[PDB]
Design a protein around this ligand. Sequence first.
Ligand SMILES: Nc1ncnc2c1ncn2[C@@H]1O[C@H](COP(=O)(O)OP(=O)(O)O)[C@@H](O)[C@H]1O
Ligand SMILES: Nc1ncnc2c1ncn2[C@@H]1O[C@H](COP(=O)(O)OP(=O)(O)O)[C@@H](O)[C@H]1O
Ligand SMILES: Nc1ncnc2c1ncn2[C@@H]1O[C@H](COP(=O)(O)OP(=O)(O)O)[C@@H](O)[C@H]1O
Ligand SMILES: [Mg+2]
Ligand SMILES: [Mg+2]
Ligand SMILES: [Mg+2]
Lengths: 375, 375, 375, 7
Amino acid sequence: DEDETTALVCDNGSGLVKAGFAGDDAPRAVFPSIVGRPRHQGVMVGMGQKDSYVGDEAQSKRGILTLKYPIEHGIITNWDDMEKIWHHTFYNELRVAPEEHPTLLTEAPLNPKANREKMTQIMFETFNVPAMYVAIQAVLSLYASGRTTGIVLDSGDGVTHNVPIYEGYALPHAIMRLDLAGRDLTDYLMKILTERGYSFVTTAEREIVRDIKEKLCYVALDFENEMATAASSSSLEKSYELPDGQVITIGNERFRCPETLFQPSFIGMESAGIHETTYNSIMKCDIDIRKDLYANNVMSGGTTMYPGIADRMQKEITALAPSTMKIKIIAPPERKYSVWIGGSILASLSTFQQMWITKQEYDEAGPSIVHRKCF
Amino acid sequence: DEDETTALVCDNGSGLVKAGFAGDDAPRAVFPSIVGRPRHQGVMVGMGQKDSYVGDEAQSKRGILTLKYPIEHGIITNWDDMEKIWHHTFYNELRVAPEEHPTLLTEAPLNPKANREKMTQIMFETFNVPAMYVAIQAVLSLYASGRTTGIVLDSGDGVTHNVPIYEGYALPHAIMRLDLAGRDLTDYLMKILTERGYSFVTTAEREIVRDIKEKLCYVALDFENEMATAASSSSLEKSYELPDGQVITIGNERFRCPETLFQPSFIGMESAGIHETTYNSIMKCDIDIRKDLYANNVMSGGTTMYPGIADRMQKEITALAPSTMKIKIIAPPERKYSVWIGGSILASLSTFQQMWITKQEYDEAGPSIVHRKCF
Amino acid sequence: DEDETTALVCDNGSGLVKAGFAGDDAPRAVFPSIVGRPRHQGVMVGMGQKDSYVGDEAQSKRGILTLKYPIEHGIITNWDDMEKIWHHTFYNELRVAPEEHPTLLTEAPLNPKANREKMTQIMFETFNVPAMYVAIQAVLSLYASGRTTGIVLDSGDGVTHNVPIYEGYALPHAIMRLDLAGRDLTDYLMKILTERGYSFVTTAEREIVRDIKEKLCYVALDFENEMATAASSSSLEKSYELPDGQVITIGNERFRCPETLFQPSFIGMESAGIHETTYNSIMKCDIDIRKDLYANNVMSGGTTMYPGIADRMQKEITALAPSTMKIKIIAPPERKYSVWIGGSILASLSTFQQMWITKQEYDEAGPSIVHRKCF
Amino acid sequence: AXXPAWX
Ligand SMILES: Nc1ncnc2c1ncn2[C@@H]1O[C@H](COP(=O)(O)OP(=O)(O)O)[C@@H](O)[C@H]1O
Ligand SMILES: Nc1ncnc2c1ncn2[C@@H]1O[C@H](COP(=O)(O)OP(=O)(O)O)[C@@H](O)[C@H]1O
Ligand SMILES: Nc1ncnc2c1ncn2[C@@H]1O[C@H](COP(=O)(O)OP(=O)(O)O)[C@@H](O)[C@H]1O
Ligand SMILES: [Mg+2]
Ligand SMILES: [Mg+2]
Ligand SMILES: [Mg+2]
């Protein structure tokens, strides 16, 4: 097993569990944050066929399951299913006892504090961790950059952040939160695939559409001329073989899916877009911070592996920011993992080991200790 | 280090520390007399991030600090912060031990005597200087001129002086003090910049406005025709690029800022102006002194590097003084430093080395020794 | 209609239009200063459905509109939308022709002068008013008090003032301006409601949060013991039924919202607070003014109908002011309207009818006439 | 008295 007391870094954003140990390059366990459950009856007698499938096994059996994400927009909705996800995380995937390891959880800013509080209650009461710490996810995404100055966009499966930090000091009044992320892009892609002719409605078919979004989507630097480019010829069409047979061929849907991220009116969501929430987070900072946020604009979570989103990102922030400013969009190709990687850095720091919310301090101050020790 | 017992000449007027050694051309250390302090929380763990930034480092980090001047109108208000300023002065900037060097401090006339007395108590009790001497700042500004006859205007960041001296003898009944100086001009410029459209309210933005005042202001020899000159055309407008982006364009504010110095009604301060306090200091002197004060009207501190203030100064004192008098405004371009330079002259004089308030005379007579040895 | 030439008193602070006639108790028209605009497509053919909704109609349709305030921190940002607001003000709500009536506009001190100048240009060029006059809003708030001596705090939706006046003479060097007001409190309440669990992000949901702030907030005389009082029991919790269904229950957010007004660090704004800007405005006045400002401390605009803000206000100014001073916070329950009411007094004065900026004097001196006739 | 800074 693990012969030491190495800290656990568990990172469930809203749609993908990535967990592992501190002082480590990559997360050891990366699996979908789903719990599946059979929706019709078992007939082969003597089969096993447990009435819950968590993680990657659920996508192995998703044709006979109703898949259900226990965490939506960064908020944990099903608590017993999230306990299934954590139980599978420690005991099956990462294959370790939580009693021996301090654990580092992550969440978004501007979240309900009962998420953080009940997450601490489940970590100490159910899994009996010795220490525990919730961490703001974009902050850790700046720990992976090796920077102490920068504004961080990450955009996981349920939430996007823009946390600005200058010289180690965060600017929590200048913080942002938009609930437009990759599951919303998956749903919008599923809608416009219904526009082309392909009907995906099941949760398993939603997982197929999510795969189409990951394999086969880019961001379109200039959306109008890319739109007319797809309207002119079929040079942007691309085929995807569905599981078990039929192939599909998608055109302008390839780049209309993450244009919703730059233009949230497509999914009917009144917002300013990703590029304007970055600029508005920078303009909420003080005057002497802003060029150090322009040159350090870290873009480091999931849903940013769309090809060209750093080009669209710089190309649009440059249009908002004044001239003679140096707009550098940092898009480090190890992102989708850098919230975990910065979790690994922070949990492996030696200054940090008196910042763990420990037991006998949880037992002393109840579950509200998180609002005086964590942030 | 320093292989001798050279005297320290430390000169904090109210807004800029300029310190160094005696027998020296220029002050070795010139830095802002500010102490900064973080106003929101530290988030990057393992950073250092001390909870006090003194001097130039505070302007390096002023976007996340609340800057605070420990000395206001020549009066030290925060004593622990002034001890931070002195501690940084000797041990970080000038990088020397105060135990080895007699120190020469400066202050204004007509100051509270607890400023001078507590400054002596902090120099002997805290820094353990062997000798110490407070000095009237405009007197030293006449030591830099190489003159022993003249009336001295200096106008630092918090106070302006007009000390008249004839044949080595000061006229302390004819002395003056106005509390209108460059920080008041910075605040008034910040107000009329709010009149044009640019809102500066933070202490860091106050430091930006102070920079606009230094780079981009002159004094307007004839204020009414300069005022109508700016009202006629845009030939007096000038642009200033703010830190991190946006450029501004100032017009009549370029010369309405130091017209407050010649006309204190703009900042709502009942006074006679700079040009009339000089003439009133001369008329308080005796009849046989005045033409030697007219021809030796030294104008030698900070806030006098406005272009044309010697032209406005001579042009207005000539209108007050009788005809067939020779009005010579001495404006030696080494001013903003000549209070320090005359401190260097006075501390390097050989007649002066029995005028130091020494320890074992401080210990004998308490801290009130300054009111029998200094002046 | 109106059979006379009664002057119009239009008062848009930044968030609420209150307009009417001079010589009148209450404003005739009070409606939100919003202009709404449909953000998705019209489908019922033959509907009307104009592509702009101004005023109260916009809050009748805010579920399908993006509401937008044309005036932010007392500065008019959208000029065509403010012309929609004025056009709706005269022709729909107040239902009168501007050609027949002199109009009295209000703004804050320390505003951009292009706001005042373009407001005069829009009043004469577009609406063809015979006369026009901009007025400092807290001054008019002292006209409603029946006093000619006092310091005035008002705190509308975008700006707070502290204009001190003694014996009819204002002290414009002792004037103040803080850009912390009720829309900032609405945004901060919306943030800490996201902390409890309720997500409000749309402009219509911002209007719901503003309603929660108006119905269900007080100021907490002692913030620490009120904070621990809410932490002890649920006797401070109070429920609010949202539009269309779900009820919410707010606790310490009920008094943490206007504590930002007394402590601007909550919204990350470096300032001294309301209680210290009053005391600093009094200390900038002369020595023989101050007890007549202490006994006449008028507190008379919007965002002052928090219960107990006069108790917190007196309780904190008494701690700043010296003892044996009589601190009287005047909080006349007709405030939120007293800027309009004092506008009605001033426009109905007989001495005032040669102080109107009239046309043929606008046409003679351009739009800069406001900076010689108004103030 | 006075001032700020002065008494
Ligand atoms: N290569 C890719 N291109 C585009 N989107 C991706 C890619 N890989 C993952 N995603 C999207 O990113 C989201 C997961 O991002 P991540 O931050 O790892 O999730 P979590 O928020 O659970 O940590 C999923 O919605 C997925 O659809
Ligand atoms: N070139 C310049 N033009 C106008 N004002 C200046 C210039 N340089 C410095 N000042 C002003 O002079 C003041 C500092 O003068 P100085 O006498 O050095 O201050 P101190 O009183 O700290 O000695 C500051 O307020 C600064 O704004
Ligand atoms: N009863 C109340 N309690 C607290 N705040 C209020 C109340 N009524 C109005 N407000 C706030 O006052 C602001 C409007 O005040 P007012 O002076 O009318 O604004 P304006 O600047 O538009 O004149 C709005 O932000 C509103 O939220
Ligand atoms: Mg993530
Ligand atoms: Mg000086
Ligand atoms: Mg108002």
